[PDB]
Amino acid sequence: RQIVVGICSMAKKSKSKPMKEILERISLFKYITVVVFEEEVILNEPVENWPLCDCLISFHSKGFPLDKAVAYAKLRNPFVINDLNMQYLIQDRREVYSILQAEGILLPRYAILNRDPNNPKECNLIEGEDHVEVNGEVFQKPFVEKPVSAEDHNVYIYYPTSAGGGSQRLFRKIGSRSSVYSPESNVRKTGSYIYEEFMPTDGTDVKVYTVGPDYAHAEARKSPALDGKVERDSEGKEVRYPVILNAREKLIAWKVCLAFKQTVCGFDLLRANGQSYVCDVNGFSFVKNSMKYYDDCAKILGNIVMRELAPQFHIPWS
Numbered sequence: 001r002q003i004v005v006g007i008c009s010m011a012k013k014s015k016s017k018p019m020k021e022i023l024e025r026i027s028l029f030k031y032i033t034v035v036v037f038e039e040e041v042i043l044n045e046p047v048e049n050w051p052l053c054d055c056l057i058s059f060h061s062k063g064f065p066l067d068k069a070v071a072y073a074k075l076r077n078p079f080v081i082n083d084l085n086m087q088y089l090i091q092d093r094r095e096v097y098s099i100l101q102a103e104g105i106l107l108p109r110y111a112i113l114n115r116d117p118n119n120p121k122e123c124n125l126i127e128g129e130d131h132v133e134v135n136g137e138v139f140q141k142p143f144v145e146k147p148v149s150a151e152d153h154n155v156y157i158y159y160p161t162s163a164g165g166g167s168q169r170l171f172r173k174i175g176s177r178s179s180v181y182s183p184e185s186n187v188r189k190t191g192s193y194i195y196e197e198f199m200p201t202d203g204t205d206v207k208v209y210t211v212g213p214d215y216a217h218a219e220a221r222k223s224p225a226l227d228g229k230v231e232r233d234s235e236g237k238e239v240r241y242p243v244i245l246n247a248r249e250k251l252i253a254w255k256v257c258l259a260f261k262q263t264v265c266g267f268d269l270l271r272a273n274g275q276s277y278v279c280d281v282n283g284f285s286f287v288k289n290s291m292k293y294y295d296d297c298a299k300i301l302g303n304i305v306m307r308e309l310a311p312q313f314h315i316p317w318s
């Protein structure tokens with residue numbers, strides 16, 4: 001009997017180039033068969049009708065019925081690569097930051113402003129022209145304002161008077177741009193936000209991609225917060241810069257992977273003030289346009305599957 005690896009995610013993810021490149025490589029494992037769950041089945045069929053698997057790779061993105069994935073895993077009890085219940089928490093920046101703190105992982109100093117939907121101005125935010133006070137905690141500009149929903153990428157940065165004031169409004173890339181300047185200096189007045197201290201980097205973000213706690217690919221890209229113009233290469237892809245993680249950062253990746261129980265895990269690091277701060281944990285994410293990552297990721301995942309399941313299948317594995 002072949003060991004079945006089931007892939008359960010939205011078609012946009014399951015049919016992405018990185019996914020296809022990696023699944024083709026996992027399929028090279030002699031005793032592993034890959035089954036990709038059709039999106040129509042995921043959305044419209046009860047979990048009792050979903051394909052069987054022995055190892056489940058499943059992850060939430062927009063429109064994914066996480067409730068069904070959880071029910072499926074409870075019904076079939078497969079070996080789960082990326083924990084499903086943790087994926088509820090990953091959708092909430094407050095829950096993400098709570099986990100990071102609990103694990104002794106450096107992150108920006110932050111405060112949560114929750115607005116009870118029924119009451120607009122019954123909250124504890126005091127605003128000055130160059131600072132905010134959130135539940136009594138002071139944040140001098142520059143500071144960062146993030147929607148509590150991790151799926152909401154409308155992150156704002158507020159400039160001090162000394163730099164001309166106003167704000168930088170980040171958003172999901174639309175064409176050539178990832179942010180825009182706004183003359184608006186006052187914070188958003190509806191919704192719930194995390195406020196945090198701006199960490200000064202060299203103008204790049206470090207993107208980290210784990211495959212288990214002992215493997216992490218990192219690369220850097222221009223921070224959207226600089227001017228907002230996306231750097232693109234001749235082929236039209238966003239420019240990336242080489243990164244090698246130092247010992248502290250490799251430990252960070254180990255902690256993030258295990259703490260969130262996401263074997264495959266993407267997160268952001270800000271290299272600032274001689275340290276590295278996690279500002280975002282996204283969960284399941286593959287590196288794009290790296291053949292070597294495809295090779296490495298497929299090999300590691302296949303090895304994890306074999307290590308875990310080969311005994312019960314009576315397959316030799318050393």
Ligand SMILES: O=P(O)(O)CP(=O)(O)O[C@@H]1[C@@H](OP(=O)(O)O)[C@H](OP(=O)(O)CP(=O)(O)O)[C@H](OP(=O)(O)O)[C@H](OP(=O)(O)O)[C@H]1OP(=O)(O)O
Pocket residue numbers: 061062172173207266267268280282284285286
């Ligand atoms: O390159 P194109 O414009 O064709 C697509 P884009 O580059 O916007 O891809 C983003 C990706 O952004 P990044 O460039 O890796 O920062 C996201 O990554 P971020 O979460 O922004 C990683 P970051 O937080 O910037 O480090 C995440 O990609 P993935 O990681 O899920 O593959 C998104 O997927 P989703 O969040 O919309 O489901 C995906 O958007 P989509 O492909 O759906 O249009």
Ligand SMILES: Nc1ncnc2c1ncn2[C@@H]1O[C@H](COP(=O)(O)OP(=O)(O)O)[C@@H](O)[C@H]1O
Pocket residue numbers: 108144146150152153154155170196197198199200205223224225268270279280
């Ligand atoms: N505390 C911070 N200090 C400086 N820059 C930040 C901070 N938080 C976020 N940023 C910048 O804003 C970008 C988006 O923030 P992030 O928390 O990664 O949100 P998203 O989940 O939308 O990716 C980051 O890639 C980084 O460039």
Ligand SMILES: [Mg+2]
Pocket residue numbers: 026027028029030031032033
């Ligand atoms: Mg095979």
Ligand SMILES: [Mg+2]
Pocket residue numbers: 060061282283284
């Ligand atoms: Mg995601």
Ligand SMILES: [Mg+2]
Pocket residue numbers: none
């Ligand atoms: Mg992004």
Ligand SMILES: [Mg+2]
Pocket residue numbers: 268280
């Ligand atoms: Mg991010």
Ligand SMILES: [Mg+2]
Pocket residue numbers: 150280281282
């Ligand atoms: Mg994010």
